[PDB]
Structure 1
Amino acid sequence: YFQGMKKEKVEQILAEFQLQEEDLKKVMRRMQKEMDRGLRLETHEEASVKMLPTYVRSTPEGSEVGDFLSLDLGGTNFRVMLVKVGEGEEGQWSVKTKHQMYSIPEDAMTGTAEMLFDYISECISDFLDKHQMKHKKLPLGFTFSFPVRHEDIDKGILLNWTKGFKASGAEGNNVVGLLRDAIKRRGDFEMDVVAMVNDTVATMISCYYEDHQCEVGMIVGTGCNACYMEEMQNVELVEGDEGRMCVNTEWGAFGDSGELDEFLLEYDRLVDESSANPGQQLYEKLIGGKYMGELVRLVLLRLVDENLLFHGEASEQLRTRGAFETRFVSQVKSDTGDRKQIYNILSTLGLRPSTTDCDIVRRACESVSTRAAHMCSAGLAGVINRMRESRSEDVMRITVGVDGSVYKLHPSFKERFHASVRRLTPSCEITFIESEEGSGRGAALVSAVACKK
């Protein structure tokens, strides 16, 4: 049969995306070597994986209560949230009270740091206006999801933008300062910026009240990263040898020194070469929702060239960079051969899809998505296995808090991810939980502990 012949040929093109268990162990071990290097004074500057100290400590610590503004920059949108923090019969609960999401126009994104933060300030103002509380002066917590060198919980230098951010005059500067300045320049409201955390960190924190075993935070959204509670004595960059501190791996930059060269496909190199940060964030580029749809687009385009898809004719849309969105990937079924959604997606893209085109698009989506899950699983496994060694436990029971557009909305991803992590982590009992408003709530909780002065 003809449609079978096309699918066999497709499958041989997509086999390239496979990763054997030994490929994943190789990646996992390489990741562990970079983590080791990032944690040590002598190799920290040259590590691809930076392992940044967050100054979020395991020490039970005094907390204020009340209302906090949480800002969240670094996902799809910028989010502003009122969060209530209070004491419970056990620990400290947090509850989202109000929330608004804002898109950020491309210009405010690739202009100056000042434009970007001015834009941020307008949105905050708009949200204060909506709830008539421009008069109040709140403690603000800032989830800012990019590589930051912290000197403390409320002072951090941006190391570099990732995920397509390009605002000039931001790198090397104090991010909290940029925000305070922008709010200052505006006038119509006041805020005490008291904390700044990575999204991985906020997410971990948000999950503590419900499960004291949560010591890993993971994000698979636009970007991909993880934080974990490291033995204070292994944190060579911070004085102290008791208890634990949250380390922000910034594992997205894994591969930035060649570590992944043998696994990169032409689609990967194409995506990297055309990105805002070529040569950087190579691991993230295999996984992140910012890149996943675009990888799929390049695969489809290859299949068209081989005359296996769309009768070798691609609409101008499909030939447009970024036209295949990541959400389309998540709107693609798996265990059921449903073609409805794919047919609609592809029609809107200006294509006349056959039943067979749909099935092939679904396989392309599965292939890219599945390799993302597998690659991601080697990183988390590397982390968790290392914690097991570092805590010298025969069996380690650990809870991982997860957030992000991709883990939450891609059902096939979640399942492939869990199974792969688990095969790679013998003698660890891993519980996964999806945080709810993890970024907003996590940030308020940190702000609460910071306000207590």
Structure 2
Amino acid sequence: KKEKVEQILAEFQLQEEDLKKVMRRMQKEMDRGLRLETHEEASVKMLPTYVRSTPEGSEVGDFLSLDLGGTNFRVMLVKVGEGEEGQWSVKTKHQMYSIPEDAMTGTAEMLFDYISECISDFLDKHQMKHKKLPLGFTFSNVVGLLRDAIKRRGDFEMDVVAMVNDTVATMISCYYEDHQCEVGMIVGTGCNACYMEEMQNVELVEGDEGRMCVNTEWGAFGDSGELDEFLLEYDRLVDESSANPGQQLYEKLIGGKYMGELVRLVLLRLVDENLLFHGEASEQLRTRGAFETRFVSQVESDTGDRKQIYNILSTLGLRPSTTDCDIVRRACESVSTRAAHMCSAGLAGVINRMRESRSEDVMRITVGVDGSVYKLHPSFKERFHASVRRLTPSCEITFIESEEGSGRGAALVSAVACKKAC
């Protein structure tokens, strides 16, 4: 009769006036991360990449793929251009090197030197030895071992941003299919985004001609107390128990890493005052990391017969009723929505900036998306879109998932090898 749960789950309710507020606070702190002066002060660092569209003969899709496994080591060069028919085209080049016994059997340093030797070769042959190409390292500190071996060598030099995230590998893997794709986003265990920004608005780069992919690193949003007012009790507790207190606050409101725990602490708030398991805090329910995120995905995939939900509670030593199990539906529901609504605020802040940096009133853009929390969570993928389009009028957004059978920095190498076939 109380309906007190609705009062508690109101804590997670965010109105549009609140979401726009985030979007603005978001745009501000990613402007600061682009401005040379306020870069070191900014939570959102907005690091750039080697991914760029420029007159000097660089297009988004240009890529250098290293793959290693067994004695064999492969190198691929992806290059985007314009075809004979002036068509958007792609051309690939491959080369396979054999690793000597002594190098493979030897150290890690003995190895990445042979590697940096076989890269100079490949690049000196295709005349691409100093044209800084995005880098990805597939397999069958590693990011640094490779840089070191090169610095020791004297042929050429790569910066630390050559290596691409999974967020940008996403964007590219999608761009090959949907050239209008200029945003890339991950929402899984973690959360991060990248997008194409006007080189003139990027101060941390030498050049104002063209546009560049910028890794936002927006997970650290809130580290400067930009969110102090949106944070709840439950939100602060996780941070104090986490390995990185006072960091990645934004990514924590949405992380698939701490999404499950965020339900648990809500349940422990209900048992303390309310009729949820009649005050019985289970032996497992009081344990940290018990309530895995894979649960909230299951409870919300419940076909309304409660069976899928019972199967989870019957695992936590909990024997529920027809009443309390449906609150757990509402608990997860109240988090999932906030996780989506929060993510939609950030992505809107990006899109709206791309429209302000463009002389178009209507912007038909495309987004390359990936992530467990996105692709598998039942309701998340949608309630997300909804919030976004409410925050970005005059923008025909088109979302596209990165295809399966492919993970990272290799979706990219496969998604391209399947387009020389054209």
Contact 1:38-1:49 at 8 Å conserved across structures: yes
SS of the aligned residue for 1:70 comes to strand
- Partner SS for 1:379: helix
Is the CA contact (8 Å cut-off) linking 2:173 and 2:415 kept in structure 1? Answer: no
How far did 1:142 drift?
A: 3.3
Cα distance per residue 1:367-406 (max 9 Å; x no partner)? 0111000011000000000000011321111101000110
Distance 2:399 2:175 in 1: 13
Mapped pair 1:398 → 2:365: yes
Alpha-carbon deviations, 1:73-119, whole Å to 9, x = none?
99999999999999999999999999999999999999999999999
Residues 201 and 267 (structure 1 numbering): CA distance in 2 closer, same or farther, change over 3 Å? same
Structure 1 position 180, deviation (Å): 7.6
> Does the residue aligned with 2:76 lie in a helix, a strand or coil?
strand
Per-residue deviation, 1:431: 0.3
- RMSD of Structure 2 on Structure 1 (CA): 8.3
1:120 and 2:87 aligned: no
In structure 2, C-alpha distance between the alignment counterparts of 1:108 and 1:357, rounded to whole Å: 62
Distance in structure 1 (CA, Å) of the matches to 2:285 and 2:135: 43
> Measured at CA, do residues 399 and 66 of structure 1 come closer, stay the same or move farther in structure 2, by a change above 3 Å?
closer
Q: Partners in 1 of 2:180 and 2:273 — Cα distance?
A: 51
Alignment check: 8 A CA contact 2:170 2:412 kept: no
- By how many angstroms is 1:33 displaced? 0.5
Would you say the 8 A contact 2:345–2:388 is kept in 1?
yes
1:331 counterpart = 2:305: no
TM-superposed CA distance for 1:306, in Å, is 1.4
The answer to whether the Cα contact below 8 Å between 2:302 and 2:309 also exists between their aligned partners in 1 is no
Aligned pair count reads: 420
Distance 2:237 2:70 in 1: 23
Are residues 306 and 48 of structure 1, via their aligned partners in 2, closer, same or farther at CA, if it must alter by over 3 Å? same
Cα distance 1:427–1:87, how it changes in 2: closer, same or farther (>3 A)? closer
SS in 2 for 1:26: helix
1:426–1:281 Cα change, 3 Å: same
> In 2, are the aligned partners of 1:142 and 1:195 still within 8 Å (CA)?
no
Distance 1:307 1:451, change over 3 A: closer
How far did 1:363 drift?
0.5
Aligned to 1:75: 70
Q: Distance in 2 between matches of 1:111 and 1:314?
A: 55
Q: Answer whether contact 1:69 1:83 (CA < 8 A) is retained.
A: yes
Q: Distance between the aligned counterparts of 1:39 and 1:344, measured in 2?
A: 49
- CA-to-aligned-CA distance 1:135-191 (integer Å, 9 cap, x gap): 99999823899xxxxxxxxxxxxxxxxxxxxxxxxxxxx752246889999999999
Supply the distance in 1 between the matched residues of 2:158 and 2:222 (Cα, whole angstroms).
40
CA contact (8 A) 1:117 1:179 kept: yes
Q: Distance in 1 between matches of 2:49 and 2:89?
A: 21
Identify which range, 421-430 or 193-202, moves more after superposition: 193-202
SS in 2 for 1:228: strand
CA separation of 1:86 and 1:427: change in aligned 2, threshold 3 A: closer
Higher relative contact order (CA 8 A, sep 6+): 1
Corresponding residue SS for 2:161: strand
Distance 1:389 1:101 in 2: 46
Alpha-carbon distance in 1 for matches of 2:248, 2:304: 34
Change in CA separation of 1:8 and 1:105 when aligned onto 2, cut-off 3 Å: farther
Give the whole-Å Cα distance in 1 for the aligned partners of 2:287 and 2:269.
14
Q: Is the 8 A contact 1:62 1:452 kept in 2?
A: no
Considering fraction of residues, name the structure with more strand: 1
Q: Structure 1 residues 93, 140: closer, same or farther in 2, change over 3 A?
A: farther
Deviation at 1:352, TM superposition (A): 1.0
* Preserved CA contact (<8 Å) 1:206 1:445: yes
Tell me the secondary structure at the aligned position of residue 299 of structure 2: coil
Secondary structure of the residue aligned to 1:108 is helix
- Alpha-carbon separation, structure 2, partners of 1:355 and 1:256: 41
Question: How far does residue 9 in structure 1 lie from its aligned partner after superposition?
Answer: 1.7
Q: Does 1:242 align with 2:237?
A: no
Deviations 1:271-330 (A, max 9, x none): 111111000000110011011001011111111111321111111211111111111111
Q: Residue 427 of structure 1 aligns with which residue?
A: 394
Query: Is the 2:49–2:134 contact (alpha carbons within 8 Å) kept by the matching residues of 1?
Result: no
Structure having the higher Rg: 2
Provide closer, same or farther for how the CA distance between residues 125 and 336 of structure 1 changes in structure 2, counting only shifts above 3 A: farther
CA deviation digits over 1:383-434, x for unaligned, max 9?
0000000113211111010001100011211111000000000111100000
Using a 3 Å threshold, how does the CA distance of structure 1 residues 277 and 430 change in structure 2: closer, same or farther? Answer: same
Q: Which moved more, 1:394-403 or 1:194-203?
A: 194-203
TM-score, normalising length: structure 1: 0.72
Of all paired residues, the percent bearing the same amino acid is 100
Provide the rounded CA distance (Å) in 2 between the counterparts of 1:105 and 1:307.
68
For residues 43-71 of structure 1, the C-alpha deviation after alignment (integer angstroms, 9 at most, x for no partner) is: 00101111111121124998999999979
Residues 220 and 406, structure 1, Cα contact 8 Å, conserved in 2 = yes
Partner Cα separation in structure 1 for residue 250 and residue 101 of structure 2 = 25
Pairing partner for 2:273 from 299, 306, 309: 306
Ranges in structure 1 where 5+ consecutive residues have no aligned partner: 1-5, 146-173
Alpha-carbon deviation of 1:133?
A: 26
Pairwise CA distance, 1:334 = 6.6
Q: Distance in 2 between matches of 1:426 and 1:41?
A: 31
Does the residue aligned with 1:137 lie in a helix, a strand or coil?
A: coil
Distance 1:182 1:214 in 2: 35
Structure 1 Cα separation of the partners of residues 104 and 372 of structure 2: 20
Tell me, which stretches of 5 or more residues in structure 2 are unaligned? none
d(CA) in 2 for partners of 1:103 and 1:326? 43
Deviation of 1:357 after TM superposition, in Å, equals 1.6
**Contact 2:78/2:92, CA 8 A, preserved across alignment:** yes
Contact 1:200 1:226 in 2 (8 A): yes
